């Protein structure tokens, strides 16, 4: 049967401002089947207690979820989403970039 690979975006709820508290989000979308593993990373390492939205889907039946955690961005602290799904042979890492 047929499988669709997740689309990935890492972004903040509000425009990033160093030392100013915010939310880091990872929005995975366009995927099928529904099972997915998404981590938010801080300098390479799994942020604990990340929360997520309830499983829903679009008109084409492809699923989507928001994963989110509080964060205070800084100059040098790197941030990323790490995503795995049956469609991917390896976990996909996507870095946070304040201009994306």
């Amino acid at each position: 049967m047929i499988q669709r690979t997740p689309k990935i975006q890492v972004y903040s709820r509000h425009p990033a401002e160093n030392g100013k508290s915010n939310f880091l989000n990872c929005y995975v979308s366009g995927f099928h089947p529904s099972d997915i593993e998404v981590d938010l990373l801080k300098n390479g390492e799994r942020i604990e207690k990340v929360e997520h939205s309830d499983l829903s889907f679009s008109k084409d039946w492809s699923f989507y979820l928001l994963y989110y955690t509080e964060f205070t961005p800084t100059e040098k602290d790197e941030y990323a989403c790490r995503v795995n799904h049956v469609t991917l042979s390896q976990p996909k890492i996507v870095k946070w970039d304040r201009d994306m």
């Binding site: 047929i2 975006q9 889907f57």
Partner: protein, 276 residues
């Protein structure tokens, strides 16, 4: 404005790992108001919006019952789907349903829906007439025959023109401070040099509700569909949505490009430029 209510079911089998998970989520437009999960500690329909908390204990009991009964229903459906497609009982499969109603600004039924999919593929859909069905294949025609025999469309039709629109009308009045407020996008154009010879112009839209939005770039008043990178509208986490459109442009040519924004919360469409 025009509005919609939708219920989304996902039923996911997981052989070796218990009975299929059943999830239901309800939406008015782009706002989730209710949820149910069979994998919850004590599964019930839960409020997800302040304007639904209103409804009394009987509402919550009656809605929970519906979801517990439908858990069994969609679990049977999954077993049946295996047989109709001659599939093994070792694989994991998914059934989804969407159903609900659209209403116009006077709150009259614009159209109703009832659609199922199996493994991300169309299975059966109630047609727009609310009287007939479209089966995607010979498996789904068995269901159609069963549903035709049982006069299912008639029953959906009574619901869709009746309770679906009555409740959405009530939800809209109770949640009118948010459901009937459109928030316009906050828009700006950013500038990111790529090379000596090329730059990215990125047109942002932030803080908007509902999710619908058009963001386009023009060069000398001509649409740049092929030459624009357009991200999927993403949620911010505070009810609002975000989007951006990007164009790579030659150095010195930034003023030939204009960003155009259309959104419900905007009385007229917007035109933005890179403003150095």
């Amino acid at each position: 404005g025009s509005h919609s209510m939708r219920y989304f079911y996902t039923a996911m089998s997981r052989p070796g790992r218990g009975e299929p998970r059943f999830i239901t989520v309800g939406y008015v437009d782009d706002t989730l108001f209710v949820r149910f999960d069979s994998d919850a500690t004590s599964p019930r329909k839960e409020p997800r919006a302040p304007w639904i908390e209103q409804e009394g204990p009987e509402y919550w009991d009656r809605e929970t019952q519906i979801s517990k009964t439908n858990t069994q229903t969609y679990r049977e459906n999954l077993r049946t789907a295996l047989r109709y497609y001659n599939q093994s009982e070792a694989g994991s499969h998914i059934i989804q349903r969407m159903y609900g109603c659209d209403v116009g600004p006077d709150g009259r039924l614009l159209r109703g829906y009832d659609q199922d999919a199996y493994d991300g593929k169309d299975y059966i859909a109630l047609n727009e007439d609310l009287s007939s069905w479209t089966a995607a294949d010979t498996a789904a025609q068995i269901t159609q025959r069963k549903w035709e025999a049982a006069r299912v469309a008639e029953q959906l039709r009574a619901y869709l023109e009746g309770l679906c629109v009555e409740s959405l009308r009530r939800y809209l009045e109770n949640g009118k401070e948010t459901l009937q407020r459109a928030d316009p996008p906050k828009t700006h154009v950013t500038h990111h040099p790529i090379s000596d010879h090329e730059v990215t112009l990125r047109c942002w839209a932030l803080g908007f509700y509902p999710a619908e939005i058009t963001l386009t770039w023009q060069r000398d008043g001509e649409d740049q569909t092929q030459d624009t990178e357009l991200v999927e509208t993403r949620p911010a986490g505070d009810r609002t949505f975000q989007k951006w459109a990007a164009v790579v442009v030659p150095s010195g040519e930034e003023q030939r490009y204009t960003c155009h924004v259309q959104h419900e919360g905007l009385p007229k469409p917007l035109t933005l430029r890179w403003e150095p």
